[PDB]
Swiss-Prot record, chain A:
CC per GO annotation: cytoplasm; cytosol; cytosolic small ribosomal subunit; small ribosomal subunit
InterPro entries: Rbsml_uS13_C, Ribosomal_uS13, Ribosomal_uS13-like_H2TH, Ribosomal_uS13_bac-type, Ribosomal_uS13_CS
Organism for this UniProt entry: Escherichia coli (strain K12)
SUPFAM superfamilies named among the record's database cross-references: S13-like H2TH domain
Name this polypeptide is given: Small ribosomal subunit protein uS13
GO molecular function, one term: tRNA binding
Keywords for this protein: Ribonucleoprotein, Ribosomal protein, RNA-binding, rRNA-binding, tRNA-binding
UniProt-listed PANTHER family: 30S RIBOSOMAL PROTEIN S13/40S RIBOSOMAL PROTEIN S18 (PTHR10871), SMALL RIBOSOMAL SUBUNIT PROTEIN US13M (PTHR10871:SF1)
Coiled coil location: none
NCBIfam families noted in UniProt: uS13_bact (TIGR03631)
Gene it is expressed from: rpsM
Curated annotation (Swiss-Prot), chain C:
GO cellular component, as recorded: cytoplasm; cytosol; cytosolic small ribosomal subunit; membrane; ribosome
Keyword tRNA-binding listed: yes
This protein's name: Small ribosomal subunit protein uS7
Keyword tRNA-binding: yes
Its biological purpose: One of the primary rRNA binding proteins, it binds directly to 16S rRNA where it nucleates assembly of the head domain of the 30S subunit. Is located at the subunit interface close to the decoding center, where it has been shown to contact mRNA. Has been shown to contact tRNA in both the P and E sites; it probably blocks exit of the E site tRNA. Protein S7 is also a translational repressor protein; it regulates the expression of the str operon members to different degrees by binding to its mRNA.
Annotated gene: rpsG
Family from the record: Belongs to the universal ribosomal protein uS7 family.
Entry keyword set: Ribonucleoprotein, Ribosomal protein, RNA-binding, rRNA-binding, tRNA-binding
Lineage of the organism: Bacteria, Pseudomonadati, Pseudomonadota, Gammaproteobacteria, Enterobacterales
Result of changing K34 to A/E: Defective in ribosome assembly
An MF annotation (GO) of this entry: structural constituent of ribosome
GO biological process terms on file: cytoplasmic translation; negative regulation of translation; ribosomal small subunit assembly; translation
Source superkingdom: Bacteria
Assembly mode: Part of the 30S ribosomal subunit. Contacts proteins S9 and S11. Cross-links to IF3 and the P and E site tRNAs.
UniProtKB/Swiss-Prot annotation, chain D:
GO MF, one example: rRNA binding
SUPFAM superfamilies: Glucocorticoid receptor-like (DNA-binding domain)
Subunit (UniProt): Part of the 30S ribosomal subunit. Contacts proteins S3 and S10.
PROSITE patterns: RIBOSOMAL_S14
Name of this protein: Small ribosomal subunit protein uS14
Its job: Binds 16S rRNA, required for the assembly of 30S particles and may also be responsible for determining the conformation of the 16S rRNA at the A site.
Species: Escherichia coli (strain K12)
PANTHER family documented for this protein: 30S RIBOSOMAL PROTEIN S14 (PTHR19836), SMALL RIBOSOMAL SUBUNIT PROTEIN US14M (PTHR19836:SF19)
Curated annotation (Swiss-Prot), chain E:
UniProt keyword Cell wall biogenesis/degradation, yes or no: no
Superkingdom of this protein's organism: Bacteria
Record-annotated membrane-spanning stretches: none
Matching PANTHER family: RIBOSOMAL PROTEIN S9, SMALL RIBOSOMAL SUBUNIT PROTEIN US9M
GO biological process assignments: cytoplasmic translation
GO molecular function, one term: structural constituent of ribosome
Native source species: Escherichia coli (strain K12)
Family statement: Belongs to the universal ribosomal protein uS9 family.
Protein task: The C-terminal tail plays a role in the affinity of the 30S P site for different tRNAs. Mutations that decrease this affinity are suppressed in the 70S ribosome.
Name of the protein in question: Small ribosomal subunit protein uS9
Subunit structure: Part of the 30S ribosomal subunit. Contacts 16S rRNA. Cross-links to the P site tRNA and weakly to the A site tRNA.
Pfam families, sorted: Ribosomal_S9 (PF00380)
Amino acid sequence: ARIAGINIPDHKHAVIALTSIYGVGKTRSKAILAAAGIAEDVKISELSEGQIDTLRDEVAKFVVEGDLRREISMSIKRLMDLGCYRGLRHRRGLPVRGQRTKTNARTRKGPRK
Amino acid sequence: RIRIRLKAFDHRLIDQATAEIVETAKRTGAQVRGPIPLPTRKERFTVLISPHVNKDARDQYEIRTHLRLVDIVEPTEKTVDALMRLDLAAGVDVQISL
Amino acid sequence: RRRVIGQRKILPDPKFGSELLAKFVNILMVDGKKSTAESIVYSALETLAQRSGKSELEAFEVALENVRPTVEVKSRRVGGSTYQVPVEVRPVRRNALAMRWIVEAARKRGDKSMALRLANELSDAAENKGTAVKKREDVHRMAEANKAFA
Amino acid sequence: AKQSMKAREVKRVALADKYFAKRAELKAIISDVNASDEDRWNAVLKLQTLPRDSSPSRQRNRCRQTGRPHGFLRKFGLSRIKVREAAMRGEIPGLKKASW
Amino acid sequence: NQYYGTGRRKSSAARVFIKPGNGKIVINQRSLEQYFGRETARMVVRQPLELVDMVEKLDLYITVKGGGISGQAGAIRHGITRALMEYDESLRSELRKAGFVTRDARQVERKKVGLRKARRRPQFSKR
RNA sequence: CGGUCCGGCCGGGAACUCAAAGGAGACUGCCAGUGAUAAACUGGAGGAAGGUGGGGAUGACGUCAAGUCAUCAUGGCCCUUACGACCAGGGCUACACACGUGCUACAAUGGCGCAUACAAAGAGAAGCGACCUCGCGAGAGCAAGCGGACCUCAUAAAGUGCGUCGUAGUCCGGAUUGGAGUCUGCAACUCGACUCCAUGAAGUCGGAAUCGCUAGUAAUCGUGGAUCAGAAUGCCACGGUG
């Protein structure tokens, strides 16, 4: 049985095609599967009749994939125009993670090689 | 319920001082108890050796304190009251508490 | 300039009093852990008894004798540019090198279970092919040319 | 020497003990509310947090004999250089240099 | 008759009591696999004991304090040797010839300051 | 051995660890082999064990046309409409280029998850903080013992085990970019900790070349302390494996 993606490896683990969808991954997938009693122990693909349509509505309670993947790349868009450190370094290619440029700043020139 | 402590930095000086409490406790009394030597307590300190460089090895110190509890079997007025009002115990520290 | 230092006998094994096995665990020890060697000890000989293992009187001491190091060298000098010379190794060194040659030959490519990778090498230790033999002959072709002027 | 570094110390660590070594309750009252989504305090936080010449922060003890900010030992009241100087002269009790 | 021995090794100290007539092995009021079951070399304690055989005609009671599972084994082997040398005058010769009376007494090294690695020195070469 | 919050817990013992002062033991002394029938080594014997016992503190003279006036004095030069001091901000986290030291993964003989054995040594009365919690959790809430051989920091981690993952260059390594937060302080733009839910990357011990140690050493994994608004991969001890 599935609630997301298009295909799953048969009984190997129920978390495949439900993990890595944004907002749900390797933690929430097991808590969602536990809403139908689906476990890591004595694994099976068979889900009895009348049990799929409410579980398939749990994964629909918020946004999934590309429409939620917007947000991880939206703070770099929400500030660009101001001449401050955050604005300028999000309209020009410059470091933003407190790393030492003395030294090693040549990695901004490219590959390497 | 009156109790004693004998503190030193030398392991022979403290025994030479213990024997003078064992004298005091049997100068009018007859009853005495064995003085326990107890585990020595130590404190260590590591610092730069000199006011110039030596930036590959710090200099190390260790302090060692010897303590005895002695136990007075009959701490009578004619045994301890003059000692609680004056020591009179050199090279060591005598502490009397109630 | 004279080493020659002390004297160190080491201890025998706790279950049969073996001197060779108590030394072989000191070759499979990595990160100071002997437990990983005790997962490979006896299990390699018992896994050889799934494929070819006939007689166990010496366990693996004759596999370590069919493995035969001979091409050890030293450097001789009177100044700058040096001259290579071959050396006739003692049985205690011949054995110490044979113990590495076989476990390094069993490690040559990545696979599952070292007891099984070593059992595959011990089943070969009756005919000795490829690993621990083909490099030996390719350097032994200088073994007399490096004696000529002593 | 720079005696202005002691003039800081006199109004910091030597004056903080009665007013700033416990003070966090005097700001926590602005987080004391009867209910959520309701205010009774507004901007009075900027009056409860008004001091600047004195703080729980910026407090350096310094060496009490050399004014030095690094290499002090609280248990002796001396620095790395004066611990040897007093020990070599024998002017500090219980401490010895060698031989265990 | 009650036979007794003591021994020390690698920050451990042991007591051993032996009595003639069939019994068992006991260590710190438990068996030799309830806490010792983790390790692979405890049979060093049996090295002097094969000369009277593994608990078929005697009863063995052990107590040990401090140290790890290889230190405790060397201290218990020393205690067994110290008891069995009284159990027969012929074993008083044999246990001395087998060298089980010999003590191992080192565990650490001393400073001799400084060195960040105590014995290893920092790299001299390079540039 | 008597009684038992069944607890070395309480009487009690003094045997046994241990904590500790005091005696014994080891002198090349004995014997052989070499060798001025020398001195001295090598070997053997005893014993728990030698051969500066194994080890500490160890530093004779003179040191390089050598460092330090920023640990402290002090000759000289020079400033004081300042090369002051009292504040608000900066710089010390510019990289146009030149060199290194760590630590973690590069795995399978391993990792991941979940249980379980063992301390050693410090530190602790505006402090170490148990128990029980409120909550997804950092944190926040209440409060005992403790002046520390009588409580707390603190279920040591390697190791022992059961499931599970597998050569795909790793759905490993989880950095990194977001979301939701919790706190410290006048205040977290750059450039602060710590937590939960997403996120998704380089990387098969290496190239000229080159290190450290003969023993509890090299190799490897945990514990503690000082410095202390909040935060060390910084600086020193302690122990397991070996």
